[PDB]
Symmetry: D2
Subunit: 79 residues, 4 copies
């Protein structure tokens, strides 16, 4: 089963742009190796990325937002 | 409510797929559960609303205008 | 001199997303054959695309917005 | 006010360049004259504000955070 990557972002914070950018960085790099990348509207200060439910990134844990380079490496780890 | 956009990967339709995804999320925001970008094969470009068909290059022909896409989604909320 | 493509869009209409999408479609297709693609904030109902100042597209003339396929062909005409 | 973002074409940095462009235009809107996406060569990623340097991978190191980019632009308005 190809992996489902989910990017949950705070809607009111206007983090849609950065979420959509990262989604494209992953899909342009991994292409069909990924089942999909979902952009999921979320609440206050939220910004999390999961790989089949497994934690990949969370602003609350890693702090701030992921650099494209790091995000790609972390997904590579799981893929 | 899950919106899914399946696009032909080799056709480099990711760009237009992610554009549409943002047009929907920026417009409907949290009224949408999510918008999934789903890599696909040759000439594919489909959009589903909870599994229901909203757009298909083969049926509707071509690609949707942001205005049309928004209206169809709005019609299903 | 590489060509300057300018995309002027109505700011309050929220047409930035479509302008930025088209800019990427052109730069991903023509790459360095283009000097640049500028996103230019504009006023009410405006959406125009120029190629070195020359008209390429204008909502007021062509009506509506350009399909990626058409925009690419029109730029190809000039390039 | 002209903001220019020059990026390495072959590095496929167009995506991050266009992302930043939108972050600036969606934030500052008409206060900006324009944001130009300028194809470049090997490892280049520079951002100028009317010719003045705002960012350079070689100087600042890496790529800017949306928050940092917005602050520097804000500082020059």
């Amino acid at each position: 089963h190809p992996p489902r990557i989910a990017i949950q972002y705070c809607t009111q914070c206007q983090w849609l742009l950065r979420a959509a950018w990262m989604a494209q960085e992953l899909l342009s790099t991994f292409g069909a190796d990924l089942g999909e990348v979902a952009l999921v509207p979320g609440t206050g200060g939220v910004f999390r990325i999961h790989y089949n439910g497994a934690p990949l990134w969370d602003r609350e844990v890693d702090g701030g937002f992921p650099e494209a380079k790091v995000l790609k490496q972390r997904v590579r780890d799981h893929l």
